[PDB]
């Protein structure tokens, strides 16, 4: 979407948290959002 040269870095390394998704760990309330997707 964004030209790396203007946007900088991040477009391809966004929304993944080092201390959670990167370590395969769920935060304490994240499931509430997932469950809200389930009908």
């Amino acid at each position: 979407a964004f030209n790396p040269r203007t946007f900088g870095s991040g477009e391809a390394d966004c929304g993944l948290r080092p201390l959670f998704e990167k370590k395969s760990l769920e935060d304490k309330t994240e499931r509430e959002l997932l469950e809200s997707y389930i009908d």
């Binding site: 870095s9 966004c14 929304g15 080092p18 959670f20 309330t29």
Partner: protein, 250 residues
């Protein structure tokens, strides 16, 4: 944030705190979308009635902050702003239509365990996740109630509310550039953004690629966490072209 909980360390690494330089004062929230671009609410930067019309030099941003009282040496980063961009059609006189602004940092920041960008929604993601009933997450260092201030970043998950219901909860003119969220009186759960939470992100975790996406920006509300009232957020996807134009312009 009213009726929320403490955020765990590193739970919202895109969280940004917008500060007044002189005198030092926490003003709003914001979000990190890249190593050099920060998104926030336009009214956090420009709202003449509240004597707000900041220039790049009047502000500072803090990133990766865990406590508002101390300085995490090499953990939290303080950055100066190079340039400020306010949406040209931001309507501050009437209903805060297009309450969105971009700020470019003087120097890009290095990502870490405590600092990382949030994703901006693409057409496909926005379609499948931006639906009434689906819950998002709002974070902030703003007021704990209609007033005080927290010592730890606050968080609360809230369901997006159907347009017709948002429209009836207020007489302020709602636009397609806004969406509202919050529990109904009958749902038995509470929570809402409040004063100084403006600019903070309303994020959603995509069960698909497991990435967090910023769907909204805390923009306005009447009171905080009142029954039958809902928080209003700037509809980020709807204004992505302006974001594109600005970032790809400069």
């Amino acid at each position: 944030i009213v009726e929320g909980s403490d955020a765990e360390i590193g739970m919202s690494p895109w969280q940004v705190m917008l500060f007044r330089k002189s005198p030092q004062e926490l003003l709003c929230g914001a979000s990190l979308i890249s190593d050099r671009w920060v998104l926030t609410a336009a009214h956090c930067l420009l709202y003449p009635p509240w004597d707000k019309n900041f220039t790049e030099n009047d502000l500072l941003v803090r990133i990766g902050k865990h406590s508002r009282t101390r300085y995490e040496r090499n953990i939290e980063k303080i950055s100066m702003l190079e340039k400020i961009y306010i949406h040209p059609r931001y309507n501050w006189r009437e209903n805060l239509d297009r309450d969105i602004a971009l700020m470019k940092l003087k120097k890009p920041v290095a990502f870490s365990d405590y600092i990382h960008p949030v994703c901006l929604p693409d057409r496909e993601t926005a379609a499948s996740l931006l639906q009434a009933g689906y819950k998002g997450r709002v974070t902030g260092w703003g007021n704990l109630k209609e007033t005080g201030q927290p010592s730890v970043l606050q968080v609360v998950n809230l369901p997006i509310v159907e347009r017709p219901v948002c429209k009836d909860s207020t007489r302020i003119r709602i636009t397609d550039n806004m969406f509202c969220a919050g529990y109904k009186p009958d749902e038995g759960k509470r929570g809402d953004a409040c004063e100084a939470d403006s600019g903070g992100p309303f994020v959603m975790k995509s069960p698909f690629n497991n990435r967090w996406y910023q769907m909204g920006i805390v923009s306005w509300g009447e009171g905080c966490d009142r029954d039958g009232k809902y928080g209003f957020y700037t509809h980020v996807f709807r204004l992505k072209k302006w974001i594109q134009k600005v970032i790809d312009q400069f």
